[PDB]
């Protein structure tokens, strides 16, 4: 109870601290400085964390990175789309 | 062993994906567009995670948040100095 309470408090603060910038970026679609490669690595760690949570039976590390997956994944997808739009625009 | 192997792989990628940007910002001291508050929140969870790693004997989540603390703490310390320096200069 004490351990899980502490972890959920740790969870909440880590994933939701900089979440407004992810949400803002998704809405605004301003991916001008975003690194595609740096997000790929980040997401690789995230999916792995989910797997690590399943193995160790840890709710906190599971729920945290599952949410952090869903906040970062669209940012990566949108960033890739914007670059693709740049490729076609430059090609024209 | 195989489980701890998975955690370290997860740890390495998450804490070192965006580490270059923090190291960059530390040296350049360009703390413009950096939230004091959002970093306050961040580091609070980090230390809480450190406490969680101790509590559940999870080596992987502990060292992950240990290192991540040394990437973030200088950024907040430096951005406080910058905002301070801007304030007295403006005054």
Distance from the B91 Cα atom to the nearest Cα atom in chain A, whole angstroms: 31
In this complex, the residue of A6, A14, A41 whose CB is nearest that of residue B46 is A14
Could A45 and B11 be called an inter-chain contact, meaning their C-beta atoms sit closer than 8 Å? yes
What is the number of other CB atoms lying within 10 angstroms of the CB of residue B83?
Answer: 12
CA distance A84 to A91: 11
- Neighboring chain A residues of B17 at a CB cutoff of 8 Å: 38-39, 41-42, 45
Q: Identify the three-state secondary structure at position B19.
A: helix
Among candidate residues A15, A5, A48, A49, the one with its CA nearest the CA of residue B45: A15
Could A10 and B49 be called an inter-chain contact, meaning their C-beta atoms sit closer than 8 Å? yes
Give Cα separations from B78 to A10, A77, B10, B52, B74 (angstroms): 24, 33, 29, 27, 6
Q: Are A41 and A53 a contacting pair, CB within 8 Å?
A: no
What is the number of other CB atoms lying within 10 angstroms of the CB of residue A28?
Answer: 9
Q: Does A19 touch chain B (CB under 8 A)?
A: no
A-chain residue closest to B45, CA distance: A10
Measure CA of the first residue to CA of the last residue in chain B; give whole Å. 58
* Helical spans, DSSP H, in A1-92: 2-16, 19-28, 36-56, 59-91
Q: Identify the three-state secondary structure at position B68.
A: helix
Of the residues B56, B60, B65, B69, the best mutation for testing chain A's interface (the one with the most A CB atoms within 10 Å of its CB) is B56
Q: Does B30 touch chain A (CB under 8 A)?
A: no
What is the number of other CB atoms lying within 10 angstroms of the CB of residue B74?
Answer: 16
- State the structure-solving technique: X-ray
- Neighboring chain A residues of B51 at a CB cutoff of 8 Å: 6, 10
Q: Are B15 and B71 a contacting pair, CB within 8 Å?
A: yes
Topology of domain A1-92 in CATH is Monooxygenase (1.20.1280)
Longest CA span, chain A: 61
Class of domain B1-91: mainly alpha
Residue with tokens 């792989």: B9
């Amino acid at each position: 109870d004490t351990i899980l309470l502490t972890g959920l408090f740790a969870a909440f603060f880590t994933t939701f601290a900089f979440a407004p910038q992810s949400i803002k970026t998704i809405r605004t679609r301003n991916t001008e400085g975003i690194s595609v490669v740096m997000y790929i690595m980040f997401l690789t760690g995230v999916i792995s964390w989910i797997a690590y949570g399943i193995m160790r039976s840890d709710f906190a590390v599971l729920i945290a990175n599952i949410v952090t997956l869903f906040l970062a994944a669209p940012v990566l997808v949108i960033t890739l789309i914007n670059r693709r739009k740049k490729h076609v625009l430059e090609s024209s």
